[PDB]
């Protein structure tokens, strides 16, 4: 799951 964006988490 990423943010808006994608910092992958």
Same mark, same amino acid.
């Given at each position: 799951?990423?943010?808006? /964006? /994608?910092?992958?988490?």
């Amino acid at each position: 799951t990423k943010s808006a /964006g /994608g910092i992958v988490l």
